[PDB]
């Protein structure tokens, strides 16, 4: 998904399946669409809900990529407080 | 099917959920987090979100919220300087658009305890009477003996 | 920050993966990306070309420029290292530079550039480092 900014439903679905592959490459195509500069906020609480305690790097990586580049405007699954989803389980 | 267990620390989640998943009463440290099980009851495979109920923690169930078909909310039946918090989490979670039609199970537990409230006071002070909107239940358990879980796992299963 | 971005460009006339170290180049990425490594940075050939008022700092690969840009500089032999260092992780990810492959890896091209240059300052990585990220 090299700039596709409507793809936004799909993400969701291929956010969580059931294979952490599909939740992988999902992430990943957030970030490339927002790293452009496109459409982010919907999926959020899909996005926050496998990764979170693990100490499985890969996801863990991909979602401690998006807490850089867009955290504050993104608040579907995240909203706003000290321990946010960003650094909760993330200590 | 999808279980979001919650409730406030110290009530007994994951005292809960690894009696359900080991027969075991384990030495549980708080869970900054969340724990998840697969659990098997009479042909169902009940995934359960043990999702810690210390504040920080407490401030990220919304995540959990989507795709939830019940939710157990455990209630520490010995504590009555909380349980008007916990009515306080338990009605707004109550509000929640992604947990509008998930069944509603209480577990009013540490039952064991002498001076336990009931399960009857329970719901009177948890304002359980008032959902008119989905299926609720309310369960007495003792976590450690196992009382009352799988009477809870199929009031659940019968959503 | 003395290092804007941190970007892999397609001449197509985007940057194709980049990385904003804190927000402040989004769009502005793409923007720059896209309109001066399709030139060559503006390049005769020449690793360091400065156009616009942004130094570019690039080496092509195929129809795609890895790129580096600064608008400020602390020293001559920093800018070229980080560039360099990137050019040994990114076949890594992508068998060389392709926008499809490009942008396949968005996610490991893109934690290696904070990991890489953190803040705009030119930490260093390694392929075994990049590792125990994407584990």
Known sequence: MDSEPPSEISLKNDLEKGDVKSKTEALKKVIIMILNGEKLPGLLMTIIRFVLPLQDHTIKKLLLVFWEIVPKTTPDGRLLHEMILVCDAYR | ?159 | MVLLAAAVCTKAGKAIVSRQFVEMTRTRIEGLLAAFPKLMNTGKQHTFVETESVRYVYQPMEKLYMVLITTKNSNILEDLETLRLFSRVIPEYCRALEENEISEHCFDLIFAFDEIVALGYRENVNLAQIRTFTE
């Open chain 2, 1 to 159: 099917m999808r279980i979001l267990m919650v409730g406030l620390d110290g009530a007994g989640k994951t005292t809960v959920l690894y009696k359900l998943k080991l027969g075991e009463v384990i030495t549980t440290i708080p869970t900054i987090g969340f724990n998840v099980e697969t659990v098997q009851y009479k042909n169902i495979s009940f995934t359960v979100w043990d999702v810690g109920g210390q504040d920080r923690i407490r401030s990220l169930w919304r995540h959990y919220y989507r795709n939830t078909e019940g939710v157990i909310f455990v209630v520490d039946s010995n504590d009555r300087s909380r349980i008007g918090e916990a009515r306080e989490v338990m009605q707004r979670m109550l509000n929640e658009d992604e947990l509008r039609n998930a069944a509603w199970l209480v577990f009013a537990n540490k039952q064991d305890l002498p001076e336990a409230m009931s399960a009857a006071e329970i719901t009177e002070k948890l304002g359980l009477h008032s959902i008119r909107n989905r299926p609720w239940f309310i369960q007495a358990t003792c976590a450690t003996s196992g009382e009352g879980l799988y009477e809870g796992l199929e009031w659940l299963s019968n959503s």
